[PDB]
Design a protein around this ligand. Structure first.
Ligand SMILES: NC(=O)C1=CN([C@@H]2O[C@H](COP(=O)(O)OP(=O)(O)OC[C@H]3O[C@@H](n4cnc5c(N)ncnc54)[C@H](OP(=O)(O)O)[C@@H]3O)[C@@H](O)[C@H]2O)C=CC1
Ligand SMILES: NC(=O)C1=CN([C@@H]2O[C@H](COP(=O)(O)OP(=O)(O)OC[C@H]3O[C@@H](n4cnc5c(N)ncnc54)[C@H](OP(=O)(O)O)[C@@H]3O)[C@@H](O)[C@H]2O)C=CC1
Ligand SMILES: COc1cc(C(C)(C)C#Cc2c(C)nc(N)nc2N)cc(OC)c1OC
Ligand SMILES: COc1cc(C(C)(C)C#Cc2c(C)nc(N)nc2N)cc(OC)c1OC
Lengths: 157, 157
């Protein structure tokens, strides 16, 4: 199983200046709930934004930088390597990895952030022609989660 | 001057179940700055959501209820009475007063909430064909103000 895991806004913004344009705890919970005990594949710039690997899962970083060495983090150097990773693998970002993998994944877990933010990185366009809505769940709002959001699970037709 | 004063979302939602669907401190300050020392005109249901008049300005409530009696609150019974109120009058809501007044105001101060919220009351459709953008200012996001928003001042051509 190859899955995309992404949060994007109404215009498909996923980031600004190497950061998330919003903070939504319930979505971090959704990421944790889904990828804990599985595998995350991510591009080099996305990793730098985190700095430390995420606990209780395999962290895999894609980069051409051949001297790349961070502890608790596995390194790969081409897209072809991704298919040799075992288990549920989540394409975790960022923009360039999402662009390379959208045509290859079996399904997508997309959190639609129901708002318009300033961004400089984007999730690629996609149409509901190619994607079956397996589920759509409206995010619950409270004092920590103030932007409306929708959990979509999309499966390639 | 007869002005509209409103906060609406990307689908022109202004309320849900007689409350605001969001909380935006910077927009409350925008209301304070703009209306203090002038007049707010509002519908009965909008008033009942507040309960007490707002400080440092004339509060006028529109209702057909001839028994309506609240201290600090002026009462009118026809739309025609709005035109005999002196100074800068802000049409303050809600949906029904906005519907009655949109074709009559000189201008509108609209805070666009750049998100999609669940609502049951709406600001009427308007086109930028009939309205000049006097100013458009991006709201500043901090820890207390988490939803993107834009302050619009629109003037009838
Ligand atoms: N909202 C969301 O769901 C998420 C948002 N983001 C956001 O995305 C932005 C970062 O995205 P972006 O700038 O595109 O960068 P990426 O995170 O996708 O990193 C790009 C890097 O990945 C490496 N790489 C990509 N493809 C290959 C390949 N085929 N072979 C070898 N190496 C490859 C290269 O590294 P190198 O140059 O070292 O060789 C490249 O510079 C940030 O703003 C971040 O916040 C990220 C994930 C999720
Ligand atoms: N986001 C925003 O900028 C704002 C949002 N709101 C929201 O709007 C919603 C309320 O809107 P809505 O339900 O339409 O109610 P309104 O506040 O507009 O009031 C409706 C009532 O106003 C009185 N009224 C209106 N027109 C007349 C008239 N021509 N003659 C006599 N009386 C009149 C009537 O009261 P009566 O029945 O007693 O005669 C009518 O029932 C709330 O959810 C509130 O949160 C409100 C203001 C701003
Ligand atoms: C999972 O937590 C983080 C996610 C992220 C990124 C931005 C890389 C992500 C993501 C992501 C989110 C938040 N939601 C969904 N649905 N998918 C994603 N890939 C960065 C972090 O550092 C700031 C994180 O915490 C340390
Ligand atoms: C401005 O104060 C309030 C406004 C309001 C309403 C919702 C009536 C309003 C409004 C309004 C806002 C928030 N922004 C803009 N730009 N215009 C408005 N008319 C309700 C309140 O309590 C329930 C308020 O606090 C006392």
């Amino acid at each position: 199983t190859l899955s995309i895991l992404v949060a994007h806004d109404l215009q498909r913004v996923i980031g600004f200046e190497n950061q998330l344009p919003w903070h939504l705890p319930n979505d971090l919970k959704h990421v944790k709930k889904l990828s804990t005990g599985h595998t995350l594949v991510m591009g080099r710039k996305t990793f730098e934004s985190i700095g430390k690997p995420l606990p209780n899962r395999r962290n895999v970083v894609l980069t051409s930088d051949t001297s790349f060495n961070v502890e608790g983090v596995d390194v790969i150097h081409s897209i072809e390597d991704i298919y040799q990773l075992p288990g549920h693998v989540f394409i975790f970002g960022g923009q360039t990895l999402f662009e390379e993998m959208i045509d290859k994944v079996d399904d997508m877990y997309i959190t639609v952030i129901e708002g318009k933010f300033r961004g400089d990185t984007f999730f690629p366009p996609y149409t509901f022609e190619d994607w079956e809505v397996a589920s759509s769940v409206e995010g619950k709002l409270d004092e920590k989660n103030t932007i409306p959001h929708t959990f979509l699970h999309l499966i390639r037709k």
